Enzyme design. Structure first.
Site, PDB file in Angstrom:
ATOM      1  N   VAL B  20       0.831  -1.209   0.000  1.00  0.00           N
ATOM      2  CA  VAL B  20       0.000   0.000   0.000  1.00  0.00           C
ATOM      3  C   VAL B  20       0.873   1.270   0.000  1.00  0.00           C
ATOM      4  O   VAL B  20       0.474   2.303  -0.558  1.00  0.00           O
ATOM      5  CB  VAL B  20      -1.052   0.003   1.189  1.00  0.00           C
ATOM      6  CG1 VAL B  20      -0.461  -0.521   2.443  1.00  0.00           C
ATOM      7  CG2 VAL B  20      -1.613   1.378   1.442  1.00  0.00           C
ATOM      8  N   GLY B  24       0.925   4.021  -3.231  1.00  0.00           N
ATOM      9  CA  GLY B  24       0.676   5.431  -3.010  1.00  0.00           C
ATOM     10  C   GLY B  24       1.425   6.324  -3.989  1.00  0.00           C
ATOM     11  O   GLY B  24       1.023   7.465  -4.214  1.00  0.00           O
ATOM     12  N   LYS B  46       7.134 -15.877  -0.417  1.00  0.00           N
ATOM     13  CA  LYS B  46       7.736 -17.050  -1.044  1.00  0.00           C
ATOM     14  C   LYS B  46       7.020 -18.331  -0.619  1.00  0.00           C
ATOM     15  O   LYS B  46       6.860 -18.583   0.585  1.00  0.00           O
ATOM     16  CB  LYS B  46       9.221 -17.125  -0.684  1.00  0.00           C
ATOM     17  CG  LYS B  46      10.105 -17.935  -1.616  1.00  0.00           C
ATOM     18  CD  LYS B  46      11.564 -17.545  -1.361  1.00  0.00           C
ATOM     19  CE  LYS B  46      12.550 -18.190  -2.347  1.00  0.00           C
ATOM     20  NZ  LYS B  46      12.227 -17.896  -3.769  1.00  0.00           N
ATOM     21  N   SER B  50       9.307 -23.372  -2.415  1.00  0.00           N
ATOM     22  CA  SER B  50      10.374 -22.575  -3.030  1.00  0.00           C
ATOM     23  C   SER B  50      11.509 -22.281  -2.055  1.00  0.00           C
ATOM     24  O   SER B  50      12.682 -22.257  -2.452  1.00  0.00           O
ATOM     25  CB  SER B  50       9.828 -21.256  -3.566  1.00  0.00           C
ATOM     26  OG  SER B  50       8.835 -21.449  -4.565  1.00  0.00           O
ATOM     27  N   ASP B  70      14.449 -13.034  -0.235  1.00  0.00           N
ATOM     28  CA  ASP B  70      13.173 -12.848  -0.935  1.00  0.00           C
ATOM     29  C   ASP B  70      11.956 -13.575  -0.349  1.00  0.00           C
ATOM     30  O   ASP B  70      11.003 -13.860  -1.092  1.00  0.00           O
ATOM     31  CB  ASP B  70      13.312 -13.259  -2.410  1.00  0.00           C
ATOM     32  CG  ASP B  70      13.693 -14.703  -2.578  1.00  0.00           C
ATOM     33  OD1 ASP B  70      14.343 -15.221  -1.652  1.00  0.00           O
ATOM     34  OD2 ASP B  70      13.363 -15.317  -3.625  1.00  0.00           O
ATOM     35  N   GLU B 124      12.640  -8.022  -0.698  1.00  0.00           N
ATOM     36  CA  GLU B 124      13.216  -7.793  -2.019  1.00  0.00           C
ATOM     37  C   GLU B 124      12.240  -6.973  -2.857  1.00  0.00           C
ATOM     38  O   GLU B 124      11.097  -7.362  -3.030  1.00  0.00           O
ATOM     39  CB  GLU B 124      13.565  -9.126  -2.708  1.00  0.00           C
ATOM     40  CG  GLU B 124      13.660  -9.106  -4.266  1.00  0.00           C
ATOM     41  CD  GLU B 124      13.893 -10.502  -4.865  1.00  0.00           C
ATOM     42  OE1 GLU B 124      12.952 -11.093  -5.467  1.00  0.00           O
ATOM     43  OE2 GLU B 124      15.022 -11.022  -4.705  1.00  0.00           O
TER      44      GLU B 124
HETATM   45  N1  LIG Z   1       9.996  -9.967  -5.690  1.00  0.00           N
HETATM   46  C1  LIG Z   1       8.812 -10.543  -6.225  1.00  0.00           C
HETATM   47  N2  LIG Z   1       7.655  -9.852  -6.265  1.00  0.00           N
HETATM   48  C2  LIG Z   1       6.515 -10.352  -6.769  1.00  0.00           C
HETATM   49  N3  LIG Z   1       6.418 -11.596  -7.273  1.00  0.00           N
HETATM   50  C3  LIG Z   1       7.542 -12.344  -7.261  1.00  0.00           C
HETATM   51  C4  LIG Z   1       8.799 -11.844  -6.728  1.00  0.00           C
HETATM   52  N4  LIG Z   1       9.777 -12.913  -6.844  1.00  0.00           N
HETATM   53  C5  LIG Z   1       9.051 -13.926  -7.442  1.00  0.00           C
HETATM   54  N5  LIG Z   1       7.827 -13.565  -7.660  1.00  0.00           N
HETATM   55  C6  LIG Z   1       6.884 -14.460  -8.234  1.00  0.00           C
HETATM   56  O1  LIG Z   1       6.691 -15.595  -7.314  1.00  0.00           O
HETATM   57  C7  LIG Z   1       6.400 -16.771  -8.145  1.00  0.00           C
HETATM   58  C8  LIG Z   1       7.356 -17.880  -7.868  1.00  0.00           C
HETATM   59  O2  LIG Z   1       7.990 -17.645  -6.633  1.00  0.00           O
HETATM   60  P1  LIG Z   1       9.496 -18.125  -6.386  1.00  0.00           P
HETATM   61  O3  LIG Z   1       9.938 -19.052  -7.476  1.00  0.00           O
HETATM   62  O4  LIG Z   1       9.544 -18.849  -5.070  1.00  0.00           O
HETATM   63  C9  LIG Z   1      10.559 -16.684  -6.166  1.00  0.00           C
HETATM   64  P2  LIG Z   1      11.836 -16.542  -7.456  1.00  0.00           P
HETATM   65  O5  LIG Z   1      11.424 -15.446  -8.433  1.00  0.00           O
HETATM   66  O6  LIG Z   1      12.053 -17.823  -8.210  1.00  0.00           O
HETATM   67  O7  LIG Z   1      13.243 -16.224  -6.754  1.00  0.00           O
HETATM   68  P3  LIG Z   1      14.297 -17.423  -6.651  1.00  0.00           P
HETATM   69  O8  LIG Z   1      14.822 -17.898  -7.946  1.00  0.00           O
HETATM   70  O9  LIG Z   1      15.483 -17.029  -5.853  1.00  0.00           O
HETATM   71  O10 LIG Z   1      13.836 -18.681  -6.008  1.00  0.00           O
HETATM   72  C10 LIG Z   1       6.499 -16.331  -9.553  1.00  0.00           C
HETATM   73  O11 LIG Z   1       5.158 -16.064 -10.039  1.00  0.00           O
HETATM   74  C11 LIG Z   1       7.291 -15.105  -9.518  1.00  0.00           C
HETATM   75  O12 LIG Z   1       6.967 -14.325 -10.686  1.00  0.00           O
HETATM   76 MG   LIG Z   2      13.719 -14.241  -5.740  1.00  0.00          MG
END
Ligand SMILES: Nc1ncnc2c1ncn2[C@@H]1O[C@H](COP(=O)(O)CP(=O)(O)OP(=O)(O)O)[C@@H](O)[C@H]1O
Ligand SMILES: [Mg+2]
Ligand SMILES: Nc1ncnc2c1ncn2[C@@H]1O[C@H](COP(=O)(O)CP(=O)(O)OP(=O)(O)O)[C@@H](O)[C@H]1O
Ligand SMILES: Nc1ncnc2c1ncn2[C@@H]1O[C@H](COP(=O)(O)CP(=O)(O)OP(=O)(O)O)[C@@H](O)[C@H]1O
Ligand SMILES: Nc1ncnc2c1ncn2[C@@H]1O[C@H](COP(=O)(O)CP(=O)(O)OP(=O)(O)O)[C@@H](O)[C@H]1O
Ligand SMILES: [Mg+2]
Ligand SMILES: [Mg+2]
Ligand SMILES: [Mg+2]
Lengths: 195, 182, 180, 186
Positions: B20, B24, B46, B50, B70, B124
């Site tokens: 939010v 803004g 996450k 994952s 993340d 992140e």
């Molecule tokens: N910082 C972020 N903000 C919003 N969505 C995110 C994001 N990082 C990942 N996503 C989304 O989360 C979903 C999958 O999550 P993950 O695979 O666990 C994170 P990641 O993007 O693979 O980082 P990682 O490679 O270090 O594991 C995907 O739809 C991805 O687009």
């Molecule tokens: Mg990531």
């Protein structure tokens, strides 16, 4: 100008409802892990100035504004061209409204290389007063086409219909780029289903 | 399986609050009829699968998964390549958190007010252009469908799509530039 | 008067942010016990009220930033005792500063596009019962333009009393439940 | 388990649609500068556990839980007791569903069949719609919490204060309908 806000109330409500309904599609598809044909959904109620001006040009008398087909609008966005036909078939099969025949924006569809499409529905809104049928226009675009269309709409409002020669040509270039991005995506989704 | 949902609680709330906060920014521009550098914002916590999967690769002991950057993530979509730079400049200037030492990411330490008191959670923040994000989304999907090993024929179309997205952005930047010749 | 929309931007944003933060309290509990918070609302004081209040309190336009409730949040509780708990939570938070019913004002540090900007924010705490009455008192005091006719004022006073009672009853239920 | 998760899909969706349809009611009035029969609308999908709990209790056959009327439940909250029949009737009057088969009359409840459009065609779903006054619902909440905390058997010391509270809530409703009353002579 204060009877306007009152007039549009039924138009917001139908928007808010088709909004949540349409958004259910992606959610259902998220449980198949299958590709959702729908990336996202937006809606809007046409502004008074947009409505009056459109009446002007379409020579729609003011006691007949209800005939205007886009006072209530929704926009469904998809990754792939081929998703559109899927979405179209879903909307025809639905029974909580009915599709109103029409043949508009035939040039707009075509100029866009068929990446922008739309169909009008008659939606039966439950009122305190009973039942009120309202036109709702449902656009269907690719993410890529929608990106381009958004920019075109801004500059078009920025220069109030007079986009400088210089900027028009860069905007035409941007269009072909978007058109090409889709080309390569359709080929992705194409190559995949060769499974 | 649900002591997890307890671990993740301060991350969800960090995401909701920043969600939010950043939303803004586009709001503050809407009355300017000046251009919003941010087009829209999403966030996710996450997935528990994952986290372990990632903890494997990067050789992260279970007792140090809080050093994983993340668990809480936001993503900021911009219209123009130039926006990404304006947004990054904004993040570095904000005092409601602190930054830790066509695309970009940074990590913030976000001071989450809790019932127990104060708790700093890493978040992140990603910054992309719309075009970039569309391509990156398909890449992620496929990279799951073909389980990390994408077929060759598909990989190419992916490379061409990627390059298609970049032209779209480059064309987009020149509109932006030419308009600014006012 | 298009200045108003431009003016109220930081207040909407602050209310929006506080809203998500205060609603996080209830979330934190309903995973760990009884939440002292039932639900939360917030509102940006509408332009008409700002102006009327300003006249009343005789505040000139170059000071309406001194009006404490241009942003307002309202937190609702079940139990009188709950309010005290929220009171202390609020006083213990660092993302701002403090400067059957209760209200405090915070100075919320909003990160704006051009730098920081501290805006005043009024946070009301109320039991569910007290609020229900207050709603009506507000609505009628509106509909009747600030002169409520006595045949109605006495009825409102009884509802006020009825609600106060019910909280007395609910304090007791809490008191007996705690004998464990 | 994900048998459940996927099974609950049509219920979650139907609660969300009716939630939006019903919030229109308060919108429509609060624009007209009239009084709104509805103060707010909430909704719940029955937790998996409670469906199994209510299973054994009412001699269910889990093969036919879809006969269970409150998997998808909505609850409308009114300022006054007189509003409830006003809502009840608006509810009987709508055409986007069809209506089907202690606290006194401060609480009502009814069951609709909702014609849910899904990806693979239509699916009618039963949704329960409780209508309560704000007061009614506030006591019900504590009542429900304790009845749950003390597993269905409440300590006699507490049941008493409950009955007392329940009488305080009921009197509150009486004072409120007297307010609405003296305002109905304007
Ligand atoms: N910082 C972020 N903000 C919003 N969505 C995110 C994001 N990082 C990942 N996503 C989304 O989360 C979903 C999958 O999550 P993950 O695979 O666990 C994170 P990641 O993007 O693979 O980082 P990682 O490679 O270090 O594991 C995907 O739809 C991805 O687009
Ligand atoms: Mg990531
Ligand atoms: N169906 C729809 N869904 C979402 N947004 C829409 C929409 N139709 C219009 N908008 C947005 O509403 C604004 C003004 O109206 P228009 O785009 O012109 C709708 P139209 O009827 O298709 O074109 P027209 O007004 O010339 O007739 C624009 O910002 C546009 O992006
Ligand atoms: N935190 C808050 N503070 C004040 N009003 C709030 C609020 N949260 C919601 N509201 C509501 O916002 C609505 C608008 O009322 P206002 O026009 O602002 C009069 P007020 O601010 O309540 O009294 P006041 O002008 O004497 O200060 C009221 O129904 C009020 O209850
Ligand atoms: N129709 C409804 N709308 C909104 N909330 C509801 C509801 N029915 C139940 N709830 C709420 O859902 C929570 C738990 O409900 P459950 O115990 O799982 C089903 P129940 O209706 O309470 O018992 P039941 O089996 O006798 O029908 C409670 O907070 C309750 O108040
Ligand atoms: Mg249109
Ligand atoms: Mg006030
Ligand atoms: Mg029930």
């Amino acid at each position: 100008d204060k009877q306007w806000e009152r007039f549009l109330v039924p138009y917001r409500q139908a928007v808010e409802e088709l909004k949540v309904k349409l958004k259910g599609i992606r959610t259902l598809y998220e449980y198949e892990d299958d590709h959702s044909p729908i990336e996202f959904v937006t809606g809007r109620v046409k502004p008074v100035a947009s409505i009056l001006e459109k009446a002007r040009r379409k020579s729609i008398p003011l006691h007949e504004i209800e005939t205007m087909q886009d006072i209530a609008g929704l926009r469904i966005m998809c990754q792939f061209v081929d998703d559109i036909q899927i979405v179209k078939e879903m909307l025809f099969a639905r029974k909580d409204f009915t599709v109103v025949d029409q043949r508009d924006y035939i040039a707009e569809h075509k100029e866009s290389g068929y990446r922008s499409y739309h169909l009008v529905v008659l939606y039966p809104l439950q009122t305190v007063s009973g039942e009120k049928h309202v036109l709702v226009e449902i656009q269907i675009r690719t993410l890529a086409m929608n990106f381009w269309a958004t920019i075109e709409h801004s500059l078009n409002y920025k220069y109030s219909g007079n986009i400088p020669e210089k900027v028009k040509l860069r905007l035409q270039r941007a269009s072909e780029a978007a058109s090409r991005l889709d080309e390569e995506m359709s080929e992705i989704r194409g190559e995949v289903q060769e499974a």
